[PDB]
Amino acid sequence: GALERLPDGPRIHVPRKTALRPTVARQVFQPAFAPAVLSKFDPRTDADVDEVAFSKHTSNQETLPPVFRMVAREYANRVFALLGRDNGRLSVKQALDGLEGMDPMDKNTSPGLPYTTLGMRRTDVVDWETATLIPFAAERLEKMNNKDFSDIVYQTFLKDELRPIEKVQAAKTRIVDVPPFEHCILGRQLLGKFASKFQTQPGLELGSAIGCDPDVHWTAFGVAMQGFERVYDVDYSNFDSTHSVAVFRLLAEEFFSEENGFDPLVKDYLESLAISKHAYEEKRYLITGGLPSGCAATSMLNTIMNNIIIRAGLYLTYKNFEFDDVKVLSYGDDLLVATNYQLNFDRVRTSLAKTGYKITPANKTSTFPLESTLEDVVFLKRKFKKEGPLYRPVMNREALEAMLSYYRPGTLSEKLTSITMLAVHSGKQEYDRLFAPFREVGVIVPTFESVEYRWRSLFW
Numbered sequence: 211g212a213l214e215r216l217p218d219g220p221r222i223h224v225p226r227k228t229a230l231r232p233t234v235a236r237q238v239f240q241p242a243f244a245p246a247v248l249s250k251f252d253p254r255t256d257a258d259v260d261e262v263a264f265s266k267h268t269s270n271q272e273t274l275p276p277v278f279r280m281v282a283r284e285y286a287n288r289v290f291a292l293l294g295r296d297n298g299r300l301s302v303k304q305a306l307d308g309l310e311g312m313d314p315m316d317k318n319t320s321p322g323l324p325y326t327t328l329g330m331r332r333t334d335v336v337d338w339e340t341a342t343l344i345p346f347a348a349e350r351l352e353k354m355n356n357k358d359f360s361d362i363v364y365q366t367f368l369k370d371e372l373r374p375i376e377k378v379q380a381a382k383t384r385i386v387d388v389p390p391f392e393h394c395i396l397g398r399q400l401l402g403k404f405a406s407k408f409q410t411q412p413g414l415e416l417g418s419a420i421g422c423d424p425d426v427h428w429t430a431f432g433v434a435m436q437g438f439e440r441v442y443d444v445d446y447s448n449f450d451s452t453h454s455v456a457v458f459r460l461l462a463e464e465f466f467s468e469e470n471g472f473d474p475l476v477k478d479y480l481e482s483l484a485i486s487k488h489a490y491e492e493k494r495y496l497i498t499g500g501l502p503s504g505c506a507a508t509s510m511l512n513t514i515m516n517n518i519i520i521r522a523g524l525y526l527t528y529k530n531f532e533f534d535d536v537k538v539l540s541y542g543d544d545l546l547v548a549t550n551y552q553l554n555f556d557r558v559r560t561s562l563a564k565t566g567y568k569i570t571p572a573n574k575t576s577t578f579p580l581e582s583t584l585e586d587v588v589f590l591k592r593k594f595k596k597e598g599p600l601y602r603p604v605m606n607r608e609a610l611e612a613m614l615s616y617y618r619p620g621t622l623s624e625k626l627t628s629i630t631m632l633a634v635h636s637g638k639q640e641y642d643r644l645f646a647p648f649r650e651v652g653v654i655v656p657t658f659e660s661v662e663y664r665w666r667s668l669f670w
């Protein structure tokens with residue numbers, strides 16, 4: 211239904227072999243994670259990855275009940291009261307250069323179709339100084355500005371990453387969608403002004419943690435939540451389903467509307483995300499619903515949708531529910547619900563399942579606990595550990611060991627450096643155990659003390 215097989219086109223190359231290699235740590239930690247299946251003939255699975263990866267797009271939730279519109283409108287009222295309604299479109303120059311929020315537009319990422327087929331980079335189709343598009347691209351941009359997105363096609367391929375061993379064995383590999391470079395520019399033009407403000411003000415009050423640095427913001431998040439009787443964690447990640455097409459329509463006219471200061475073209479841009487054409491090898495699909503991955507606004511849109519969805523689930527479950535009975539902290543598929551009331555998220559799961567949405571506990575458990583506090587929850591693979599008046603993000607041990615077990619040749623040292631800043635919050639003993647496989651074979655790893663000093667100094 212929601213997946214339409216179009217006529218074939220020219221074969222776009224789809225990477226079929228992983229760039230990930232094992233480290234010396236893998237034989238020590240032996241993680242239940244491994245590189246995703248990228249090939250039909252991978253011996254670690256009995257399934258066909260080409261079929262499994264797209265089966266989520268076959269069906270899609272066509273409608274949503276009135277409560278979703280009400281919550282979207284009410285969340286919009288709170289967001290734009292905090293952030294203001296000066297949300298007009300930016301110029302191409304500003305989109306390329308960025309603003310205070312968001313770093314400048316990346317010039318070495320894929321420029322999408324048809325440029326990749328012709329062997330062109332992003333630097334070929336625009337000049338970063340003066341922001342001038344090449345004729346063909348300017349025509350494409352102008353065409354979109356007249357509400358016509360019929361030309362744009364997403365470059366789709368399998369995501370080369372670590373997956374849980376069960377997802378490896380079921381060939382449940384995720385998909386990357388790269389939009390055309392001019393479609394990204396337009397996207398950043400239309401949503402960038404709002405994105406700058408939204409992503410520089412993470413916290414309970416906004417309802418979003420997007421754009422946070424866990425090292426600093428964990429203290430603020432934790433302090434804001436510690437007074438509540440309980441905090442529940444919710445996971446939205448679901449390989450088998452995607453966002454309702456109707457959800458895009460709700461955001462277009464209740465959230466990202468002209469009334470809240472957005473450009474008239476935003477509704478059309480959001481529609482081009484909602485229903486889009488995707489090129490995968492020679493196959494061409496028209497997919498209904500779902501959020502493309504490579505768009506800059508993806509995680510922002512997902513975050514806002516999931517914030518709306520949890521309260522809608524609560525309204526659907528409890529007739530006496532009111533918006534401010536909870537506070538929400540959303541980041542993509544991860545969500546926290548802080549409250550003084552006892553809530554039964556098993557019942558909320560049942561409610562949301564009626565509208566095609568799956569929620570599960572953030573930990574390994576299959577059912578939600580009735581009792582849960584700040585010290586129990588996981589958020590972005592991190593717990594909240596109290597350290598005087600501060601909170602530190604203690605990352606799950608299996609996540610750390612998995613990260614340390616594989617790498618991409620060329621960038622080992624900078625991967626280890628990034629992991630030291632994650633592992634420091636586990637304490638010196640665990641820090642030294644995690645990096646011991648590397649140090650035993652002669653690798654110099656930064657000391658616990660050096661990284662601990664860096665974090666502590668953030669609050670002096």
Ligand SMILES: NC(=O)CC[C@H](N)C(=O)O
Nearest residue numbers: 446448451452453500501
């Ligand atoms: N990519 C999407 O739009 C779907 C994401 C959503 N969190 C899910 O249930 O899979």
Ligand SMILES: [Mg+2]
Nearest residue numbers: 246369383384
């Ligand atoms: Mg994958």
